[PDB]
Every structure is written in structure tokens, then in C-alpha cells.
Design a protein around this ligand. Sequence first.
Ligand SMILES: Cc1cc2nc3c(=O)[nH]c(=O)nc-3n(C[C@H](O)[C@H](O)[C@H](O)COP(=O)(O)OP(=O)(O)OC[C@H]3O[C@@H](n4cnc5c(N)ncnc54)[C@H](O)[C@@H]3O)c2cc1C
Ligand SMILES: Cc1cc2nc3c(=O)[nH]c(=O)nc-3n(C[C@H](O)[C@H](O)[C@H](O)COP(=O)(O)OP(=O)(O)OC[C@H]3O[C@@H](n4cnc5c(N)ncnc54)[C@H](O)[C@@H]3O)c2cc1C
Lengths: 289, 285
Amino acid sequence: SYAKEIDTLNQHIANKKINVSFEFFPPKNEKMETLLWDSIHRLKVLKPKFVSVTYGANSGERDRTHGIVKAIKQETGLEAAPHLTGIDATPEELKQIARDYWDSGIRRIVALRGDEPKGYAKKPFYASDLVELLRSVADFDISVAAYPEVHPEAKSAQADLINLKRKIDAGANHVITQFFFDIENYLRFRDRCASIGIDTEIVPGILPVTNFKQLQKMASFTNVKIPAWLVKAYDGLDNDPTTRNLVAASVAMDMVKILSREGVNDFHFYTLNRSELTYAICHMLGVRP
Amino acid sequence: YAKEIDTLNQHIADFNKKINVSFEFFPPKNEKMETLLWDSIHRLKVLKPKFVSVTYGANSGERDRTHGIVKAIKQETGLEAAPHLTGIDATPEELKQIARDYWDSGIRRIVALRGDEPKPFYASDLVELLRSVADFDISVAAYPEVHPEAKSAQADLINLKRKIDAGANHVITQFFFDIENYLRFRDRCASIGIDTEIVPGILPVTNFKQLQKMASFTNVKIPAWLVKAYDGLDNDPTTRNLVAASVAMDMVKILSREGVNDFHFYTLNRSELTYAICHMLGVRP
Ligand SMILES: Cc1cc2nc3c(=O)[nH]c(=O)nc-3n(C[C@H](O)[C@H](O)[C@H](O)COP(=O)(O)OP(=O)(O)OC[C@H]3O[C@@H](n4cnc5c(N)ncnc54)[C@H](O)[C@@H]3O)c2cc1C
Ligand SMILES: Cc1cc2nc3c(=O)[nH]c(=O)nc-3n(C[C@H](O)[C@H](O)[C@H](O)COP(=O)(O)OP(=O)(O)OC[C@H]3O[C@@H](n4cnc5c(N)ncnc54)[C@H](O)[C@@H]3O)c2cc1C
């Protein structure tokens, strides 16, 4: 029965050093700037492995990422990783960014391709190229993106998995997944990563669902399937944030309990600059002050 | 394991089976508590519960107060409201007066319990008594982890069957956290021939100090994992509500999968967790 195997899984979660990383995005107003620093001081007591700050491809808010990453190291002492994108800049520009990050104190970069505006011919620049360039400059710990449900522009699922191995070969040593809700398809993909020869954990990116209409927006660009029961679980909650936050805690803690049973001990949270759900999920993981 | 919680969630979202829920409130003892109670009632009423119910402080003498909340709920909302009644502090004739007056209000369901004096009068005796006044639907208490004063599990079970044969037709459990034990208890009730649902009393754990208090009187066991899940959260209401959501909705998803379509919520006069738990079951405005 289900009763005996949720009581075992609760007690297993009740000895392993779990590692957690938090992703923040650069804010754009004084409301969101305050929401972000609230979250940073709340979450720091869990001693995360690192925290990261996303990067506006062509948003012009490229300079905001670098300043936050410096301020986090300053005022909290957490290791902070900028994300960095390729399509926006020339190699000289990227080598200068990388050089200054390294002389700054930054040891981990999250290296991504970025997306061209919708409808644009793609530039023959890819993430493996940014990884090679970053390793030209210094010994960066480098984190790259994996797509358990295949990246929407990939030639094939085979080619996208070969690409991930290619990014590891170029020198990336940390892997973070796109968010997902099919836990079984993540596990299967994780094993394919061990088959091809990738030796770091395929670290799951956990996205707490606090606004469903926003999730429908994000998940359309990205090819991740939204299960039917999740759509049902959120119908009628458009003006009920309190219920949304509770439905979300159960969903995310279910995920994270199940990944933990299957031997995932590394979690990357898309906090969207809020702290409520990430703190509680970590808490239920045993990641506590 | 993963396909286990995925098909679990897709049976909770696919079941068109009518799920009967009911909410328990307690009589407020100040102005704050009263505002809280009435916002809960107006927030939970849209979900169309089978009934709502209002507890009774045995020796308190607040029985006029329990009766007052009940009449008020029926007038303001339309809900079927059910009083809790205890026969431990009242003479039998008083109890018959209380029942006739309840019946002329339009009350049709009474939750009938012994209560505890701080008398050889048991709950099956109050059930016989109510039933001689009128054709009440009567709900009674069941104890999956044995009532602390029973000599034995089998005797506490024989007792519960005595209350059914005495005229009751609804069963509501003390709260619990060992679900496998609840399921084995419901099997025994089936065997010994009780023909109503053994309806789970769901208690959302919004405050673990309060739960520690309620659970000492009651011989109800707190799992080691439940203590762990609340360690360090004395001053974190936000994290406690989120932790409580995951605890309740696992319990309710499993119970629902095993065929239990009837839930009774110990709302503790707050509506946040109950409205969310019902929402996930498919109970919606
Ligand atoms: C954890 C995470 C963090 C992210 N952070 C950011 C961020 O800060 N800013 C931002 O703008 N975006 C960010 N993204 C989004 C990301 O930029 C997009 O998903 C983008 O569309 C792909 O980026 P990539 O780094 O995975 O590129 P790549 O790994 O290069 O792959 C992209 C696509 O190109 C294909 N491909 C790879 N190599 C070749 C080749 N040689 N020839 C042909 N096709 C090839 C792949 O199969 C895939 O379809 C993030 C994504 C994740 C998962
Ligand atoms: C859903 C629910 C609602 C409640 N509401 C209230 C409330 O509003 N107010 C309140 O004060 N309390 C309330 N209680 C608490 C309840 O009154 C206590 O658990 C009380 O100790 C027993 O009540 P009961 O109706 O189950 O009694 P009983 O069914 O009579 O059981 C009491 C004990 O006596 C034993 N027993 C039964 N018959 C006999 C017999 N003939 N000879 C010897 N032993 C016997 C039983 O096995 C049991 O151990 C509630 C409990 C529940 C589960």
C-alpha cells in the first residue's frame, strides 16, 4: 500500500549532507529589490553551496548581475555565481568579463548560450564555446544547463545529450536541470547521463509553483510538460495566493522527497526572489540553520 | 516510486466521486477568536460540506453558547449545523429537554459523546436517550489507537458497535498520524459489522506545541518523523503552514486512494489549511 511507503520515506528524510543552491534574478524596482534582499538574508542561514544570479541576454541589465553578485559576497559571505550568456557579446568581451570576475573573487560561473529574439537566425555560437573560452581565462568551476525533456531547438534527444557531454568535456564540472514535473522522466534522463560518461550529479532545478499563470508563460518557451493533475490542482486559484502557496508546498515537497529517496542529494531552487517555499522545502530536507 | 505519486495525484484529480466533507468549530472565548471563527465559516461554506459541527465544554456550562453558535450558523449560511452534546454533566431529563429544543430549532444531527468529568454514564447511553426523543442522525467517536480508558482494543471496538446498535449512524475518528493503523482499524470495523464509513478526523498541524498538548490527554501517538518535521519551527508560522499542508495532503491522498470519500476537519476555527486540503480533494466552489 501507499501508507507504508510514505512513512518510510518521511523517516528516511528525518544523515546525508544535502547541498542546496539558490537562484535569484536581478530586480528592476524598489519593491523587488527589497523582496530580493529579504530573501537573501533569510536563506543564508541554511549555508547553501552557492547562490546564483541570472543574466539578461540582451536586457541591458547585464551590469546588474555583476553588482549583485559582488554585493552578496560582501554582505553575506556566501559564494555567489553570476550567470553569463554568449549570444550578446564578442569573445573579447566575454574574456574581459571572465577576467574581471576572477580578479573579483568569483570562482563559479553559470555558463549559458542565451536565446536570440524570437524569429532570428541563430548565431553559430553555443554554450560549449563559452565553456572553452571561460577555461581559457582561469580555473572556473562552471555550471551548465541540462534538459531532461530535451531542449526545444535540439536536433534530437540523442544530440542534446551528446551536447551536454560536450559541455562537460570543454570543462564544465556542475550540471543544473531545467525545471520539470515528470519525476520519472528526470530519473531516466539522469541515468542516460551516467551512461554517456558524465560523472557529476545531474542537479534538479526545483521550481515552486506560486503563480500558475506565470508558470504557463515560462513553460511554453521551454518544452517542459505540465501534467494534467497540476493544471487541475491550480484551476480556480487565480486570486487565491494563500491556497496556491499550500498546494505548491505539497507538490514540491513530494518531488523533493522522491528525488531524495532515489539518491539525489543536490538541489537548485528557482526562488524567483521569494523565500517562503524554498526555506520550508529545505527545512523538510533537513537543511536547517 | 515516482510513478506511484504521479498516478496517486492523477486519481485525486480524476475522481468524479462525490466527496463528503464536514468542518468542526469550537465556541470562541473572546472577541478575536469570534472574528476568526466567522471569517472561517463564510470562507468554508462555499464548499457545501455535509454539515458543520460545534463542540461542547462538558462542565463549562457553555451549552447555551454551543447551541447559540449552531442556530446562528443555520440562519446566516444555510449550512446544516450539528451540536456536540455530552451527557456527563446533565441529568437524563435535562438531556431530553436539550434534545427536544434542538429538534424544534431544525437540528437533525447531533454529535453525541460522553465527555470527561474533571458517573456510570457512557456515550451509548446518550445515544439511546437522544433516539427516544426523535429520529436524530447521531455521530459518535471512534478511536483507531484505542481510547485511553479501554481495557483493550477489542473491547473499545465492541463499544463502538454498541453505539451503532444503540441508534447512531455516523462515525468520526479521533485525529491520527499512523495511517496504516487507521486502515487496519477500518478493516476490523468492517469485520465486526459496522456499516458506516469510519470517517477520518483530519487535524491540520498548524502549531506543534498546541498539538503536543491535545495529544497527551488522548493516547494518540506523534511519529518521530512528525516531531522532526516541526523541530525548530516554534516561531515560524509560515513554515509550519507549508509543512502542515504536505502532511495533511499526503494523508488525505492515501486515504482517498484507499476508498475513503468522507473527511471531517478539525479546523480549530481557522480555514486556511482546510480550504486548501478540500481544494486538492476536488471539493470546490
Ligand atoms: C539552469 C539554467 C539557467 C539558465 N540561466 C539563464 C540566464 O541566466 N540567462 C538566459 O538568458 N538564459 C538562461 N537559461 C536559458 C538558456 O539560455 C536557454 O535554455 C537556451 O535556449 C539554451 O542555453 P544552453 O546554455 O543550454 O545552450 P546549449 O547547451 O548550447 O544548447 C542549446 C541548443 O543548441 C543545441 N546545440 C548545442 N550545440 C550545438 C551544435 N554544435 N550545433 C547545433 N546545435 C547545437 C542543443 O542541442 C540545444 O538544442 C538558463 C537555463 C537553465 C536550464
Ligand atoms: C470526534 C470527536 C468529538 C468530540 N467532541 C467532544 C466535545 O464536544 N466535548 C467533549 O467534552 N469531548 C469531546 N470529545 C472527547 C470524548 O468525549 C472523549 O474521548 C471521552 O473520553 C469519551 O467519549 P466517547 O463518546 O467516545 O465515549 P464512550 O464511547 O462511552 O467511550 C468512553 C470509554 O469508556 C469505554 N466504555 C464504553 N462503554 C462502556 C461500558 N459499558 N463499560 C465500560 N467501559 C465502557 C469505552 O471503551 C472508552 O474507553 C470528542 C471526541 C471525538 C473523537
